[PDB]
CSV table of N, CA, C and O in Angstrom, one decimal:
chain,number,residue,atom,x,y,z
A,1,UNK,N,30.2,19.7,25.8
A,1,UNK,CA,30.6,20.7,25.9
A,1,UNK,C,31.7,21.1,26.8
A,1,UNK,O,31.7,20.2,27.7
A,2,UNK,N,32.7,21.8,26.4
A,2,UNK,CA,34.0,22.0,27.7
A,2,UNK,C,33.8,23.5,28.1
A,2,UNK,O,34.0,24.3,27.2
A,3,UNK,N,34.0,23.7,29.3
A,3,UNK,CA,33.9,24.8,30.1
A,3,UNK,C,35.0,25.0,30.8
A,3,UNK,O,34.9,24.1,32.0
A,4,UNK,N,35.9,25.9,30.5
A,4,UNK,CA,37.3,26.1,31.8
A,4,UNK,C,37.3,27.4,32.1
A,4,UNK,O,37.3,28.3,31.1
A,5,UNK,N,36.9,27.5,33.3
A,5,UNK,CA,37.2,29.0,33.8
A,5,UNK,C,38.5,29.0,35.1
A,5,UNK,O,38.6,28.2,36.0
A,6,UNK,N,39.4,29.7,34.7
A,6,UNK,CA,40.6,29.8,35.6
A,6,UNK,C,40.9,31.1,35.7
A,6,UNK,O,40.5,32.0,35.3
B,1,UNK,N,40.3,33.8,33.1
B,1,UNK,CA,40.3,33.4,31.8
B,1,UNK,C,38.9,32.3,31.5
B,1,UNK,O,39.1,31.4,32.5
B,2,UNK,N,38.4,32.7,30.8
B,2,UNK,CA,37.2,31.7,30.4
B,2,UNK,C,37.5,30.9,29.0
B,2,UNK,O,37.6,31.6,28.0
B,3,UNK,N,37.4,29.8,28.9
B,3,UNK,CA,37.2,28.8,27.5
B,3,UNK,C,36.2,28.0,27.3
B,3,UNK,O,35.8,27.2,28.2
B,4,UNK,N,35.5,28.1,26.3
B,4,UNK,CA,33.9,27.2,26.0
B,4,UNK,C,34.2,26.8,24.8
B,4,UNK,O,34.3,27.6,23.7
B,5,UNK,N,34.0,25.5,24.6
B,5,UNK,CA,33.9,24.6,23.5
B,5,UNK,C,32.5,24.0,23.2
B,5,UNK,O,32.2,23.3,24.2
B,6,UNK,N,31.6,24.2,22.2
B,6,UNK,CA,30.6,23.5,22.4
B,6,UNK,C,30.3,23.2,20.9
B,6,UNK,O,30.8,23.4,20.1
C,1,UNK,N,31.0,25.9,18.3
C,1,UNK,CA,31.4,27.1,18.6
C,1,UNK,C,32.5,27.2,19.6
C,1,UNK,O,32.7,26.6,20.7
C,2,UNK,N,33.7,28.0,19.6
C,2,UNK,CA,34.4,28.2,20.4
C,2,UNK,C,34.5,29.7,21.0
C,2,UNK,O,34.7,30.6,20.2
C,3,UNK,N,34.7,30.0,22.4
C,3,UNK,CA,34.6,31.4,22.9
C,3,UNK,C,35.9,31.1,23.9
C,3,UNK,O,36.0,30.4,24.8
C,4,UNK,N,36.8,32.2,23.6
C,4,UNK,CA,38.0,32.4,24.4
C,4,UNK,C,38.1,33.9,25.1
C,4,UNK,O,38.2,34.6,24.0
C,5,UNK,N,38.0,34.0,26.2
C,5,UNK,CA,38.1,35.5,27.0
C,5,UNK,C,39.2,35.0,28.0
C,5,UNK,O,39.4,34.2,29.0
C,6,UNK,N,40.3,36.2,27.5
C,6,UNK,CA,41.5,36.1,28.2
C,6,UNK,C,42.0,37.5,28.7
C,6,UNK,O,41.3,38.6,28.3
D,1,UNK,N,41.3,40.1,26.3
D,1,UNK,CA,41.2,39.7,24.7
D,1,UNK,C,39.9,38.6,24.6
D,1,UNK,O,39.5,38.0,25.6
D,2,UNK,N,39.1,39.0,23.5
D,2,UNK,CA,37.9,37.7,23.3
D,2,UNK,C,38.4,37.2,21.8
D,2,UNK,O,38.5,38.0,20.9
D,3,UNK,N,38.1,36.0,21.9
D,3,UNK,CA,38.1,35.3,20.5
D,3,UNK,C,36.9,34.4,20.5
D,3,UNK,O,36.6,33.5,21.0
D,4,UNK,N,35.8,34.7,19.4
D,4,UNK,CA,34.8,33.9,19.2
D,4,UNK,C,34.9,33.2,17.7
D,4,UNK,O,35.4,33.7,16.7
D,5,UNK,N,34.7,32.1,17.4
D,5,UNK,CA,34.8,31.0,16.5
D,5,UNK,C,33.4,30.4,16.4
D,5,UNK,O,33.2,29.7,17.3
D,6,UNK,N,32.5,30.8,15.2
D,6,UNK,CA,31.2,30.1,15.2
D,6,UNK,C,30.9,29.5,13.6
D,6,UNK,O,31.6,29.9,12.7
């Protein structure tokens, strides 16, 4: 899985 | 912004 | 699944 | 904006 918080 | 890929 | 919150 | 693909 990929999680990106920006 | 949040991006989730599962 | 793909979830994009912007 | 929210985009969900499942």
